[PDB]
């Protein structure tokens with residue numbers, strides 16, 4: 001999907017993350033699907049907040065000073081300080097790598113699902129032509145268009161209207 | 169799938185996690201697919217056991233008491249105790265958040281796969297009607313039904329029997 | 337997919353991870369899809385390197401020796417050493433369990449995608465017969481074969497050539 | 505012994521290239537982290553299902 | 556009745572008896588893997604970053620440093636990466652008494 005069957009992104013769509021591009025007798029337009037976009041925005045925000053806000057820290061002075069006859073305590077203390085840095089540096093680096101892959105995978109599954117929505121309504125009332133592009137076998141108005149978007153698309157009202165141009 | 173194309177769950181199915189609802193001349197029934205259900209039960213149990221059992225702890229007394237001329241050691245010790253609480257609280261909170269999402273995603277992929285099994289056997293011997301509902305173009309008996317379940321469904325034995333009612 | 341609809345693996349394919357088996361008038365062959373294979377090899381290697389290389393350690397002597405009037409320090413030190421072992425043992429065991437499942441899931445999604453590539457080009461110029469097996473409705477030469485592989489497959493050049501044997 | 509290491513254990517030296525070891529908790533050097541684990545194996549390839 | 560021309564998609568297999576565990580399954584045999592856990596030592600007291608340790612034989616740090624008559628270690632070393640002492644050395648403070656800040660000296 002993302003850099004897959006749908007090769008690139010639209011600099012034309014500025015109202016969301018995932019959406020559509022329609023062209024008809026009335027004109028062409030870029031429209032973001034505000035339901036999949038919002039659920040993705042909320043979801044990711046949650047992931048981020050969890051990574052930031054879960055890190056709660058109390059007031060603490062890390063540094064400890066020892067005398068020349070306290071080398072063991074000095075080192076015990078270095079062992080603590082370094083052990084914690086080792087853990088946080090490893091965990092933090094790896095968490096980010098893992099959940100960055102997860103975020104990217106999540107967007108991909110949302111565009112593949114947004115596609116399947118449109119494919120499910122327009123069963124054979126349209127043709128799979130380009131990347132995420134569908135070619136209507138009927139005249140789809142600025143009305144029928146904005147109806148494919150909110151999923152309230154009427155299949156019969158254009159079912160037979162398609163059949164004529166279809167067989168041809 | 170889960171709260172997606174299959175909107176809700178069955179309070180009627182009490183024998184499993186994922187399953188089917190059949191209705192024919194004989195009657196209607198709720199039957200859980202005991203193979204996908206068991207593999208999901210075993211798998212999740214494993215995830216849980218891993219989270220609980222991997223935490224092995226030896227006998228230890230956390231507390232240390234210091235004198236008024238041991239404030240550095242007292243604080244060194246607080247630094248240890250707090251550093252460990254910080255790590256476990258962050259790790260534990262985040263692991264649960266991440267793997268709860270993973271569990272929920274896993275169920276969704278199992279119901280989408282259980283659906284595709286039924287769709288693969290009943291190629292055009294049935295019609296995709298509702299959510300995860302399939303409408304038979306032939307007379308499917310309590311025999312043919314219990315055969316779609318265990319995947320031993322006979323496509324030809326009902327292939328032509330469907331064709332008659334199909335074209336209509 | 338992996339141990340799913342494609343039941344097993346090929347001991348015959350030794351040039352990659354995912355690939356194809358073709359048989360025609362010229363002969364049969366095992367050919368690995370070198371693009372999906374390489375991206376999987378690079379990707380996994382990265383995961384592994386991240387797990388190994390991110391663990392950077394400085395020079396350190398863990399051991400500390402105390403006297404009979406230093407039992408608290410001795411124990412403070414045991415608390416540190418054990419707390420770190422507890423964390424690393426839990427984290428390491430769980431990371432491996434989680435990302436081993438993730439790796440296995442990743443291969444499965446690559447073979448399911450390699451399949452969908454072939455299914456997308458050979459729309460109805462072939463038939464879904466076995467596991468990941470496709471049965472050509474036309475004569476596909478050592479040329480047309482090696483063309484399904486690199487995705488430069490010509491649908492029209494065999495579109496009508498299939499139609500004849502198809503209706504039959 | 506004349507051998508050269510990056511990590512020394514009370515019972516002998518260890519290969520320090522891996523991130524973890526279950527040999528000994530008390531070491532000297534640039535050492536893998538001690539773990540109580542018996543196995544820590546990461547799958548790279550596919551499930552081996554050849555029959 | 557017959558089988559025409561085919562293309563089959565699939566995956567690799569081999570003689571590998573390697574097994575892994577996942578968060579959902581145990582003892583999964585796999586084609587290729589990687590061990591992350593070091594479970595083997597050479598059984599030798601090697602050099603550390605090019606420098607050899609200080610073997611004390613039957614002497615303790617005290618015995619060696621004070622110059623106990625049973626400690627000498629012939630024409631002696633001028634640099635060492637770590638110290639090697641026996642679990643219980645038998646040559647230390649031959650004349651009894653208290654060694655002040657001994658664990659500190661040992662560390663230094």
Ligand SMILES: *[C@@H]1O[C@H](CO)[C@@H](O[C@@H]2O[C@H](CO)[C@@H](O)[C@H](O)[C@H]2NC(C)=O)[C@H](O)[C@H]1NC(C)=O
Nearest residue numbers: 613618623624625626644645646647648649650
């Ligand atoms: C150095 O260590 C040796 C070995 O433990 C000591 O030798 C022992 O001395 C006693 C003296 O009463 C003898 O009875 C034992 O037979 C000796 N043991 C062995 C194994 O030879 C010796 O005392 C130590 N020397 C100094 C100066 O500390």
Ligand SMILES: *[C@@H]1O[C@H](CO)[C@@H](O)[C@H](O)[C@H]1NC(C)=O
Nearest residue numbers: 518519520521522590591593
């Ligand atoms: C050290 O470990 C790495 C990775 O396990 C391996 O490639 C290398 O050959 C090992 N070397 C020795 C001397 O054991």
Ligand SMILES: *[C@@H]1O[C@H](CO)[C@@H](O)[C@H](O)[C@H]1NC(C)=O
Nearest residue numbers: 572573574575581582583584
């Ligand atoms: C793992 O499975 C193999 C067979 O696939 C078997 O030979 C082996 O004993 C199993 N190991 C355990 C510990 O169950």
Ligand SMILES: *[C@@H]1O[C@H](CO)[C@@H](O)[C@H](O)[C@H]1NC(C)=O
Nearest residue numbers: 610611612613614628641645
């Ligand atoms: C140490 O003492 C043992 C006998 O207890 C003896 O065999 C050995 O040679 C002594 N010297 C060294 C350097 O270990």
